[PDB]
């Protein structure tokens, strides 16, 4: 079983956050600045960023597999023009899993175009378990969550389908 | 602790994080604390995670 659903709404879970300038010209779509489809790059609002405290409790009979971001800029200054706080970290936790992310800014070699980096993390969520989510800077959130179910393999072959 | 004894001595501790700045306060009075545990082959630094969890 695998069913693709919005861990958290894009127009309601983030009212404090902007969630559409962040965008970035390493991931091209049609010849125009995208991002991911199952995440979030959210940015401050305008000379703010507020700190944003999110929690998702699994509601379904089996396990959520939840995906998100840490965003490691290049220069002090990047941070905060995107951010606004130099001294930011993250907080991901559940019943098993806690985990405080601290953003590395520092100049890296360039690949793609892009200075910086961003590490991306994957939880399994149980059944009747809570994610969380702390931030007060650098953290692509989840936009879509991937429900699952267990029971072959990954072959890789140019072999085509019939 | 010098190991006296003519063979392997198992040790454990343990590090406690709090869920906020106030727990932390009110169980150690230092906001900024440490804790370094280092034997001849093992040294390792460890620093309180202070956020509130599930």
């Given at each position: 079983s695998f069913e693709r659903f919005e861990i958290f709404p894009k127009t309601s879970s983030w009212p404090n956050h902007d969630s559409d300038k962040g965008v970035t010209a390493a991931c091209p779509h049609a010849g125009a600045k995208s991002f991911y489809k199952?995440?979030?790059?959210?940015?401050?609002?305008?000379?703010?960023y507020p700190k944003l405290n999110q929690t998702y409790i699994n509601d379904k009979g089996k396990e959520v597999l939840v995906?998100?971001?840490?965003?490691?800029?290049?220069?002090?200054?990047?941070?905060?023009?995107?951010?606004?706080?130099?001294?930011?970290?993250?907080?991901v936790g559940t019943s098993r899993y806690s985990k405080k992310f601290k953003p590395e800014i520092a100049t890296r070699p360039k690949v793609r175009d892009q200075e910086g980096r961003m590490?991306?993390?994957?939880?399994?969520?149980?059944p009747g378990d809570k994610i969380t989510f702390e931030?007060?800077?650098n953290?692509?959130?989840p936009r879509y969550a991937f429900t699952m179910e267990r029971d072959s393999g990954i072959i890789i072959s140019d072999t085509p389908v019939h």
């Open positions: 199952n995440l979030i790059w959210l940015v401050k609002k305008g000379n703010s995906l998100w971001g840490i965003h490691h800029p290049p220069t002090i200054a990047a941070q905060e023009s995107l951010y606004q706080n130099a001294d930011a970290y993250v907080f590490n991306y993390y994957w939880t399994l969520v149980e931030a007060t800077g953290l692509v959130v």
